[PDB]
Amino acid sequence: ENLWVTVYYGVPVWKEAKTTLFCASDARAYEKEVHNVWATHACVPTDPSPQELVLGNVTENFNMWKNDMVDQMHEDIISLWDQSLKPCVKLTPLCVTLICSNATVKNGTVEEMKNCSFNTTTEIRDKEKKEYALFYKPDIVPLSETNNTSEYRLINCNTSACTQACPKVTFEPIPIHYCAPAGYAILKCNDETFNGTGPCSNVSTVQCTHGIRPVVSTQLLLNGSLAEKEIVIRSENLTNNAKIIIVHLHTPVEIVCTRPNNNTRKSVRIGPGQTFYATGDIIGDIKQAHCNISEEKWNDTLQKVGIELQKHFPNKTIKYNQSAGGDMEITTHSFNCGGEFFYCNTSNLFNGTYNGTYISTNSSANSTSTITLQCRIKQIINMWQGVGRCMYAPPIAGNITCRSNITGLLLTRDGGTNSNETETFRPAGGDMRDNWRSELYKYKVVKIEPLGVAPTRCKRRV
Amino acid sequence: INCNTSACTQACPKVTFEPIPIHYCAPAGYAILKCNDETFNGTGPCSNVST
Amino acid sequence: ATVKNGTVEEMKNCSFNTTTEIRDKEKKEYALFYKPDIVPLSETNNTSEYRL
Amino acid sequence: LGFLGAAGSTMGAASMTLTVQARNLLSGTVWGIKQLQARVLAVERYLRDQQLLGIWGCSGKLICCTNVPWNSSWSNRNLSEIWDNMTWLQWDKEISNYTQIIYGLLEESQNQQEKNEQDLLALD
Amino acid sequence: LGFLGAAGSTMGAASMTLTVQARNLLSGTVWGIKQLQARVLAVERYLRDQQLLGIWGCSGKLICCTNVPWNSSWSNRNLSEIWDNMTWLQWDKEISNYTQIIYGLLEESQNQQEKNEQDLLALD
Ligand SMILES: *[C@@H]1O[C@H](CO)[C@@H](O[C@@H]2O[C@H](CO)[C@@H](O[C@@H]3O[C@H](CO)[C@@H](O)[C@H](O)[C@@H]3O)[C@H](O)[C@H]2NC(C)=O)[C@H](O)[C@H]1NC(C)=O
Ligand SMILES: *[C@@H]1O[C@H](CO)[C@@H](O[C@@H]2O[C@H](CO)[C@@H](O)[C@H](O)[C@H]2NC(C)=O)[C@H](O)[C@H]1NC(C)=O
Hints:
The structure is cut from a larger assembly and holds three copies of chain A and two copies of chain D.
Chain A lengths: L3 E6 L4 E3 L5 E4 L12 H4 L2 E2 L7 E3 L4 E4 L5 H16 L13 E3 L13 E8 L6 E8 L4 E3 L8 E4 L22 E3 L4 E6 L7 E4 L2 E4 L13 E2 L10 E3 L10 E19 L1 E5 L5 E5 L10 E5 H15 L18 H4 L1 E4 L4 E4 L25 E9 L1 E3 L7 E3 L5 E16 L11 E3 L4 H6 L5 E6 L2 E6 L6
Parallel strand pairs in A: 3-4
Antiparallel strand pairs in A: 1-30, 2-29, 3-12, 5-15, 6-14, 7-8, 7-11, 8-9, 10-11, 13-15, 13-29, 16-27, 17-18, 18-21, 18-27, 19-20, 21-24, 22-23, 23-24, 25-26, 27-28
Chain D lengths: L10 H4 L4 H4 L9 H24 L7 E7 L9 H5 L4 H8 L3 H25 L1
The site of a molecule of 2 linked components (NAG-NAG) has 3 residues of chain A, from strand 27.
């Protein structure tokens, strides 16, 4: 028999390509107000249907690093946040001299914040009145290059102008579903042991992705998804000692955080009809902010991670260590929860090391004991470079507490020397793409090419 | 009386507040139905309806 | 500053008080401006007080 | 079986149930301008493919066999091994080189038969 | 008679002059982004209905009778009393429940015909 040309439409064929995925969220947020929360101010009500579908005979090379969804998530969150700061007050009257008092305590320890006064312009342009506010030290810098023990400045006003966060909006990470327009499909890996790049022998298709948490943290990956059956170590290239290595845990480690001080809300009219906020007197006794982690659980976590860091470094030691250094934003485990920006020192979480000896995990002497991380709090924040980089976070009155689950680590392997066999890992700060890359790893977008051509046994009946 | 509450704006001198009439109407695939019974209570059926 | 005989193409050296990073502190400063962008300020006679 | 439910099924088993994959190519929901872009882009893609099908004479689409003969230099492969036990997604990676050639012939053949639709009807 | 000029007329009398109502479903004129959204929404709606008609095999639309047999449990009403002296707007309020069932059958029947359009043409 002969063979001619025939055309089919509606064929399953794929090619991966760029596309802007639109954000969706569950319907309960869509009765809310403007800018509260961003998850509803710029998204659409999601639908659980259609449910996940599995492709019964497939092979597609997913890639966690050569991916463009994280780029879109970065761009969208920057633009969304920069839009969210527009209706807020911009604090330009606060670029004034601050005269501060020098209360002091000696012996033991103390955690004071300064009490600084400053002339303010009231509702009347040409009439002023004396005032005061309490500020944490990191946001206060001495003004004059000449010696003066009392005249200070806000750390801004040398760099760009600087804005207060609106009091009606929140930083709460409401989950987000990214999903594709018509003519595109989201392909989902479903093999639990997936290295991150290379083929998935089990591949699926979904309408909209699982709820991602736009949550910010540097050294510890907070509330999020958990691994399937074991810890997975994932890096773009493990022959490179500079690249960020992502460790995604199986079991979570619970962490509680608290600021015990019973702070007070103080308000200040600054110009016609807008109010600057500040902390008044501290009620009760002054105490230290901190976060607690159970010690045996951390030993178990770091030991299980050590078992898999030695799948690539078998003979050698793993030797965890302190952050390398740098500025306060680079070294600390910065996070926001409860509305106040914490910056916790992590040096006690990485003080010893699994030495190949997998020391016995049970029976624990006292599992209720914990290891405490001391923390410092800021009000002026530089969240990302260039996106209206200030946000003055208005203080929250009262004492606050926060409870969350650890789910992953960002680490880094230090530079070797002298052919050292005992080489060391460390916590790693990184760009936020690294943070979200731990969550969008499962997904890739494909275009549908529904037109195909084939040989067939029929001819057109002309 | 302001400056205790929000800041406050002058009306532009070139624009006017004159109520010029406005016609609202629908895109394709939609139609406007008009009741044409003069005694209409406001709600309930209209025995004479137009487009 | 003035020159006589021949020709001269000079531009003015004008000082002006400026608000620094601090709102309520000021410092003395100067800049050179071409004359077409500099106009005398007062309608009354003054040989030194100018405006943009 | 859903949207791509026949992906990986045999080309014979995947050549049916085409409508469920044809019915999904048109939809829409927007925030902002940059997703309205995607919406009109998708509408444009659908209309482009429909216009291409019409130019070949396969209007009222879905399956439409034709007259542009299968030159052997396009496949050089056996009919059973390509239809019974190959899949469309991996059939593309065997014929993707040569579709763009076939489309032009497949237009001019429509022209060549519409000429007869003109002439023979005029003579009758 | 205009746009909805046959609304209220008999189903027989309203089954004609369908073009004047089919011709009004496409138009556009916009201020701002929200009316542009309305415009593209209308275009999408038209294309969705056209694609649905094509999936049933009623391309070149307007009136198109079929094979999917009228199950008696859909109407149970006499032909004269429904065609001569009912109007379409109040016919919907007698059959609105059961159209969504019929559409899937009306797709798969077209599939079951396209199978023969393939097979019998191949054998000839
Ligand atoms: C931060 O510093 C400010 C001043 O720089 C402190 O506010 C001042 O507090 C004192 C003590 O209460 C006030 O003076 C008192 O006023 C009462 C009037 O009932 C009088 O009887 C006392 O003899 C005494 O003069 C003072 O008015 C007040 N200043 C202002 C501008 O309100 C503030 O307490 C300091 N806060 C901390 C936490 O150190
Ligand atoms: C402010 O501090 C008080 C006292 O430390 C907290 O009160 C305790 O809260 C825990 C839960 O976090 C309860 O189990 C206790 O029963 C509470 N009372 C005491 C005496 O401990 C209070 O929770 C803190 N505020 C916030 C917002 O966390």
